[PDB]
Design a protein around this ligand. Structure first.
Ligand SMILES: CS(=O)(=O)Nc1cccc([C@@H](CC(=O)O)NC(=O)c2ncnc3[nH]ccc23)c1
Length: 164
């Protein structure tokens, strides 16, 4: 039920929207979380998604980590979407502020290819420290499935479209 999106390519779409509000409106099959390897959803997209689930996402994530250990940078896991989606694909993009290799951003986007359609943020952008224009280019050049990108900041949305 996605609406108001601008088509960038055959499979990539973009909208100036809060991913939490977009998830509550659409209730997609898959919402992507901008996760860290420990699934500690403190801030950014992860903190906002977890807060919308009344912390049920953090409780579920802590049990997952206790059983399986941390994810790899560039890796992912599928957990419940709670009240936002059927599923949440927790994807770990490299955190540039922590010295993580930006080359892992392509591996992180490759996780999207296991799902026919997804609502997602730009990986590694925001508090993760990477250039969002770079993140959109890697998204477009890596993801082959249908991805609906929610870009929170209006000025960033405008720059992303103008420079595409
Ligand atoms: C530094 S920047 O990436 O160019 N600018 C930026 C400006 C404002 C925000 C951001 C990042 C910050 C971050 O969550 O780590 N936000 C998002 O990517 C985002 N996207 C969709 N829906 C959302 N709901 C809550 C956050 C959010 C980034």
């Amino acid at each position: 039920s996605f609406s108001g999106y601008l088509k960038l390519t055959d499979n990539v779409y973009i909208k100036n929207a809060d991913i939490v509000e977009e998830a509550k409106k659409v209730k997609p099959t898959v919402v992507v979380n901008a996760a860290n390897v420990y699934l500690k959803h403190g801030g950014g997209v992860a903190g906002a998604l977890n807060k919308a689930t009344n912390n049920a996402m953090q409780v579920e994530s802590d049990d997952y980590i206790a059983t399986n250990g941390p994810l790899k940078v560039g890796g992912s896991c599928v957990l419940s979407g709670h009240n936002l989606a059927k599923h949440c694909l927790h994807v770990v993009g490299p955190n540039v502020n922590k010295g993580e290799d930006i080359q892992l951003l392509k591996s992180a986007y490759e996780n999207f290819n296991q799902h026919e359609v997804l609502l997602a943020p730009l990986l590694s952008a925001g508090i993760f420290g990477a250039d969002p224009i770079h993140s959109l280019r890697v998204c477009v050049d890596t993801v082959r499935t249908n991805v609906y990108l929610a870009v929170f900041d209006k000025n960033l949305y405008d720059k992303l479209v103008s420079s595409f």
